[model samples]
Target: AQYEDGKQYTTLEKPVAGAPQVLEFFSFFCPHCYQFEEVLHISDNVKKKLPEGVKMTKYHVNFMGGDLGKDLTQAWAVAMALGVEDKVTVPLFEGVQKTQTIRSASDIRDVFINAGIKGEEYDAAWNSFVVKSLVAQQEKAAADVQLRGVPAMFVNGKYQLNPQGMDTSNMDVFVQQYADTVKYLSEK
Candidate 1:
């Protein structure tokens, strides 16, 4: 399927990199994002299918300005910066979406702790200027985008793999579709 701007995707004024970059815009508090996480759990196929030279990154959103959104954004920023996102991302989502017990920054921190993150290590990353600067940049960009929803995918920072009208119940298919779209776009 050909991707159309606005309907299926949107072009970025500036691309993410000279190489392909797939950026996932998600929210910890979003049920759809939680479901997408489950889809990711089912298969590493999407990542595996990524053509050589393409890299995937995540950008957590915080449009609501709620305490949960802000804290979860910070939580993810720390995880991403510390290179522990591979370790703690799934548990973090499960804690908030599945258990529904995570309600604050402390709870967010606990997920990392339970995942065996050392206190000093986590603290250092959490308080680091690098993490803060990165999160601030993401926050500003997300706030500026005409983002309609969460769990959105932007390919090479040039096109968004729009899932606005798509069925998300069967996310294996969803992931495959995304993989295919990335392949097609990356070749373009």
Candidate 2:
């Protein structure tokens, strides 16, 4: 993922600061996204391999449309606000990949509740102004990148890594590529 040239990944004018940012533009419902997420949970995932001083964030994409798209995007945005993304990310995708049942807002609420986030806590997160603001930001970033699909990556908000044409079937390769990309940007 390290680059001598910027042709493979689009470079940003201004990168997200405080650290080189590793932002993933993905959707919970996307199969390839789950594949990407799978490595993130494993022992040798990118989280452990990323360069020092890098910060990672997951931004849900709303391009899928319909109720599923809007609701899940909002749900993830809210989950992030409440700082339960670590607890929610896996199960949320499992629910989608397994049951395909998180269709309504209440269904998403159930996912949180099942994951030990209580009703009151979820309600607060669901309605918090911070969550709304974050969702808006995610929407803007997704559009700005012209993101066409899930399992996409942006390092330091400058370099974009899309799985569309890459050989991402292997988790080791994918994770290494992800780490290397962030490593290069973080070094710069």
TM-scores of all models? 0.83, 0.81
Clashes of each: 0, 1
RMSD of 1: 3.0
Q: After superposition, how far is residue 113 of candidate 2 from its true place, in Å?
A: 0.6
lDDT of 1 by residue, 133-173 (tens): 97886676565455657877766657767666445677677
**TM-score of candidate 1 to 2 decimals:** 0.83
lDDT of 2 at 86: 78
* Cα RMSDs, all models: 3.0, 3.3
Overlapping backbone residue pairs in candidate 1 total 0
lDDT, candidate 2, at 46: 54
Worst 10 residues of 1 by lDDT: 38-47
Model 2 worst lDDT window (10 residues): 38-47
Query: Candidate 2 lDDT, tens digit per residue, 146-184?
Result: 778777777665666634434567856756666665566
